[PDB]
């Protein structure tokens, strides 16, 4: 009775949102970007191969200096690489080897990791003793922690397998804000450039735009068919791209509140684990399960190129802040730098 | 180049420790412990977040990972166990109502693209409860599995001494339900190792060791092309 009434009201609201989106869909991104010249054949080649990890890499995050990157592999090691020289700056032994994510603080003083331990472990790289020690363990998530990104040295948004995202205060170790609303477990998060918002993709085939300070879900983006394993914010912050298991990458615009473009091909039947934009946002680099990374022209939905250099599943993909490089970690226990 | 040389020396020192830790990690055998709440998977070897059980058989250290503290949805976190030597699947063989749930879960694990290279050590637990359920006659497998009526005990069966034929037919039927799935897909890449175990069984650690030995031998032979 009451439940049926609420379900009918929810269906009416969903139809209202769908009709508003259809009314705002006068043209498509293909029509607008039809006259622009194609990017050509983007042929990136492996500049550096980082060969120190002895198990599958689950995630890699770049530092804001565009030189240092932290890599998380399921051997209990967080290796911080000097990507210019392939030097291992740090090798952090993890309490739980089942790490699924790693973050690199914009200041570079801290890194994060997490996974099946349900704990985001913050490691201080600038200790007075000269050795990296765990600074704070963030407990409170009741599922595997799938992604984490530092806003600063004291705040970090962590998305977990308990279908919730959490904003943490590292000094106190407490969830200052819990982001609820995803029915499926969240797999990735992408902080906006101004850090006032973040989009989270979950296994409910929906991506939700969250307000960090307010704590509510401002916009929910549907259109994917399967679990959204990857999410990445456009460099202007007005749009974002998702990667899913339905072998499609979809670009969602915040201010249009709907999907703009679908990046798929008929010969692609493998899910997308990682997505990342270039510095201009023109190239959408996406890692796939077919051991290859297809570079997508984000405005024209054309496969610009293929980053085929991994013998196992591509799990993570990261583009530097200056756009000079693309780091592609994978399950073959190697990270490759492409440009 | 003074600081550049120190960076390479630090990297070589770090890479040295990774090699040392990798050799230590290679001496450990990683196992995924899976099963329902009534499966009795916590009492197999008898030795928050993900729980780890460490047991050693014949100087070989096994790390059995029981993944508690997660939700009922496992399609994403089970991909973290792509490189485990074996998945230890424990089934409450006496609970007929959840046998199909165990079969569906086994079918998903067997056919998952990130678990199709992993042999499964199947434990058909609660054989003592299964024996007393069959002899009582109150609960019938044919109500939950109509093909059990047309099922005959295999000639390759090895009944325990003093075991009733109905109990032997029942437990081997449950084994063949999982073995039907295992033989239907995964051509020689991975194998199923079914074991009939009770709650008071003390040779499960040996059974895991014997199967893991078979898995690693087949993995080593597959690398050189022999298997």
């Amino acid at each position, epitope marked *: 009775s009451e439940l049926d009434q609420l*379900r009918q009201e929810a269906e009416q609201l*969903k139809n209202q949102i*769908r009709d508003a989106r259809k009314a705002c869909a006068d043209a498509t991104l293909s029509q607008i970007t039809n006259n622009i010249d194609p990017v050509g054949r983007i042929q990136m080649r492996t500049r550096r191969t980082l060969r120190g990890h002895l198990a599958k890499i689950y995630a890699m995050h770049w530092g804001t200096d565009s030189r240092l990157l932290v890599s998380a592999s399921q051997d209990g090691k967080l290796i911080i690489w000097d990507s210019y020289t392939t030097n291992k700056v740090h090798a952090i032994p993890l309490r739980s080897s089942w790490v699924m994510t790693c973050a690199y603080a914009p200041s570079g003083n801290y890194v994060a990791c997490g996974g099946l331990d349900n704990i985001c472990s913050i490691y201080n790289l600038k200790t007075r003793e000269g050795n990296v020690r765990v600074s704070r363990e963030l407990a409170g998530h009741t599922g595997y922690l799938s992604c984490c990104r530092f806003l600063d040295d004291n705040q970090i948004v962590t998305s977990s397998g308990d*279908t919730t995202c959490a904003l943490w205060d590292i000094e106190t170790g407490q969830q200052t804000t819990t982001f609820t609303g995803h*029915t*499926g477990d969240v797999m990735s998060l992408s902080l906006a450039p101004d850090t006032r918002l973040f989009v989270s993709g979950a*296994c*409910d*085939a*929906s991506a939700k735009l969250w307000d960090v300070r307010e704590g509510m879900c401002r916009q929910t983006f*549907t*259109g994917h*068919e*399967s*679990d959204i394993n990857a999410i990445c914010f456009f460099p202007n912050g007005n749009a974002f791209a998702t990667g899913s*298991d*339905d*072998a499609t990458c979809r670009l969602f615009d915040l201010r249009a509140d709907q999907e703009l473009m679908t990046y798929s091909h008929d010969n692609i*039947i493998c*899910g997308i684990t990682s997505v990342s934009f270039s510095k201009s946002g023109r190239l959408l680099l996406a890692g796939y399960d077919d051991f290859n990374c297809n570079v997508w022209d984000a405005l024209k939905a054309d496969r610009a190129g293929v980053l085929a250099g991994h013998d196992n599943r591509v799990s993570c993909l990261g583009v530097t802040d200056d756009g000079m490089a693309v780091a592609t970690g994978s399950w073959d226990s190697f990270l490759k730098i492409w440009n | 180049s003074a600081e550049d040389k120190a960076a390479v020396e630090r990297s070589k020192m770090i890479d040295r420790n990774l090699r040392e830790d990798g050799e230590k990690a290679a001496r450990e055998v990683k196992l995924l412990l899976l099963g329902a709440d009534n499966s009795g998977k916590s009492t197999i070897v008898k030795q928050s977040g993900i729980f780890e059980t460490k047991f050693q058989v014949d100087k070989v250290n096994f790390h059995m990972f029981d993944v508690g503290g997660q*939700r*009922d*949805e*496992r*399609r994403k976190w*089970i991909q973290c166990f792509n490189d485990v030597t074996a998945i230890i699947f424990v089934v409450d063989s006496s609970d007929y109502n959840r046998l*199909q*749930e165990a079969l*569906n879960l086994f*079918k*998903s*694990i*067997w*056919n*998952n*693209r990130w*678990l199709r290279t992993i042999s499964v050590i199947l434990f058909l637990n609660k054989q003592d409860l299964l024996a007393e359920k069959v002899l009582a006659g109150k609960s019938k497998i044919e*109500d*939950y*599995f*109509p*093909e059990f009526a047309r099922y005959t005990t295999p000639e390759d069966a090895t009944p325990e001494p003093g075991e009733d034929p109905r109990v032997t037919r029942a437990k081997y039927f449950i084994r063949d339900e999982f073995l039907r799935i295992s033989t239907a*897909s995964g051509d020689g890449r991975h194998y199923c190792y079914p074991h009939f175990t009770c709650a008071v069984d003390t040779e499960n650690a040996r059974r895991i060791f014997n199967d893991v030995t078979d898995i690693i031998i087949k993995m080593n032979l597959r690398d050189c092309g022999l298997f």
Partner: nanobody
Amino acid sequence: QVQLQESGGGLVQPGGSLRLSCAASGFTFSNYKMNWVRQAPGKGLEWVSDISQSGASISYTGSVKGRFTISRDNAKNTLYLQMNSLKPEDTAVYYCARCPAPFTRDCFDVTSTTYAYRGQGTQVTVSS
């Protein structure tokens, strides 16, 4: 927006017949294996049947073998379940569950409590 809409459930006499329909939208229906799951009163979620992407690989749970006939129409994006010879233990909320990933032989988590690609369900009541 992945949306599964069950229909056709209702009060049915024991031994009666009841055809369920699952209107599917928001995904390519022909790329996914489709599932039927139960919700008995006071009991956990029970998988009933699955049908493959093409419709060739069909498996039922043993309690409904010989009685239930799952079928799909990829052209109409509809998943069917012909429930003949209905018994009182079949009184449950029947959900059509879609397997999470396309082109996959494995079908994970369709019987989970908070599964996403599963409809709101229809109430099938088999009573005298």
